[PDB]
């Protein structure tokens, strides 16, 4: 099996996210907690780069090795990195428990060394319309990057 | 080409280290700066894991995919992660400029997702003798881990 962990750092938001995967043929299990969030829904994605020399800016765009448009985790068309929204409760804490069929810790498309990023706003899952449509298909209109962390290899 | 960066964090020591590599057939070029160090020589290695949930402890041992004993960068027998000593000047700053033939950002033995660690003490390069010999061949007797950072993928 493989295991990875991202320690999310930000000015006011922080957290720890674990990814475990039994084998290259199994889904990634993504679990952890993020704190300091405003109550409500917050976009959550794997971005292309783990580079934090420019804070969360240097993370680049959503991880998208297959060249798709932005969607939610259940969408037929989505970026590999599209994990949808996490929900923070009244105390500002989001508990995260997800499985994903595109995110992997094995092979050429591994997310190891890349980043996890949580956003200030809610991800529209690529379903935005009108003047929001163009950006919806890139980023889901989730707004500013509140915290980020590098996906690090961990002992299995 | 490939590029990676490690932002080293610690209680008093910090730094940024870049790794660039033109192709899988080229040597890794390792360059950057570490500050807050005592003047003198400090051990510097790639460790197996990037996991920082337990500070630098969770980095595990020196990265050693080929199952060798510890040495210096010029040794015939060394761990992949063995980068020797860096030298901090009077102001506590070490300027780093190294090339390495074992460290790579390509293929199954990539260091992406692992960690760089700088130590409080000097690495004896595996040449320790007497009661120091056993540990010399594991860690070079470099002592405590002063700072660590995950090796993150960066835009080339
Ligand atoms: Cu994002
Ligand atoms: Cu070390
Ligand atoms: Zn996306
Ligand atoms: Zn070593």
Curated annotation (Swiss-Prot), chains A, B:
Enzyme class: oxidoreductase
PROSITE patterns on file: SOD_CU_ZN_1, SOD_CU_ZN_2
Annotated positions binding Cu cation: 45, 47, 62, 119
Obligatory cofactor(s): Cu cation; Zn(2+)
Record localization: Cytoplasm
Gene Ontology molecular-function annotations: copper ion binding; protein homodimerization activity; superoxide dismutase activity
Any one GO cellular component localisation term in the record: mitochondrion
Sites where the protein binds Zn(2+): 62, 70, 79, 82
Keywords assigned by UniProt, alphabetized: Antioxidant, Copper, Cytoplasm, Disulfide bond, Metal-binding, Oxidoreductase, Signal, Zinc
EC numbers on record: 1.15.1.1
Disulfide bonds: 56-148
Gene knockout outcome: Worms exhibit increased oxidative stress and reduced brood size. RNAi-mediated knockdown suppresses the slow germline development and the delayed egg-production of clk-1 mutants. RNAi-mediated knockdown causes an increase in the number of oocytes with mpk-1 phosphorylation.
Activity control: The insertion of copper which activates the protein requires glutathione. This is independent of copper chaperone for SOD1 (CCS), which activates orthologs.
Pfam families linked: Sod_Cu
Stretches assigned to coiled coil: none
UniProt xrefs under InterPro entries: SOD-like_Cu/Zn_dom_sf (IPR036423), SOD_Cu/Zn_/chaperone (IPR024134), SOD_Cu/Zn_BS (IPR018152), SOD_Cu_Zn_dom (IPR001424)
Catalysis performed (reactions): 2 superoxide + 2 H(+) = H2O2 + O2
Cofactor note: Binds 1 copper ion per subunit. Binds 1 zinc ion per subunit.
Reported function: Protects cells against oxidative stress by converting superoxide radicals to hydrogen peroxide. Required for normal brood size. May be involved in regulating mpk-1 phosphorylation downstream of phosphatase ptp-2 during oocyte maturation.
Homology family: Belongs to the Cu-Zn superoxide dismutase family.
Subunit-level organization: Homodimer.
Protein name stated in the entry: Superoxide dismutase [Cu-Zn]
Gene behind this protein: sod-1
